[PDB]
Amino acid sequence: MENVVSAPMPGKVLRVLVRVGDRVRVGQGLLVLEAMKMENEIPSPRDGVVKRILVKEGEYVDTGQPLIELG
Numbered sequence: 359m360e361n362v363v364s365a366p367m368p369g370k371v372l373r374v375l376v377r378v379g380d381r382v383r384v385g386q387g388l389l390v391l392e393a394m395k396m397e398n399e400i401p402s403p404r405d406g407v408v409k410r411i412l413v414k415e416g417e418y419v420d421t422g423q424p425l426i427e428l429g
Contacts, residue, residue, distance in 0.1 A: 360409060363400065363426040365419045369393030374415055376426070380408045388426050389413070400425065 373390040376382060387399035388408070409429035413419060 361428050362424045365423045367393050368420045371413050371417045376408050
């Protein structure tokens with residue numbers, strides 16, 4: 359059951375913290391989203407493997423936009 363991490367709010371991708379193929383833990387930061395005058399680390403919802411990274415540093419995203427797919 360692959361699943362997708364989508365943006366919970368609009369903002370700018372400031373940093374991507376993982377690479378395709380990385381093992382991740384639940385709660386691990388996948389990227390940093392600039393929003394509400396803060397940096398916001400967007401978490402993995404579960405243990406797994408990063409299958410796809412769908413955004414790049416510098417990119418603006420909106421709510422519901424797919425960011426990361428887990429395998």
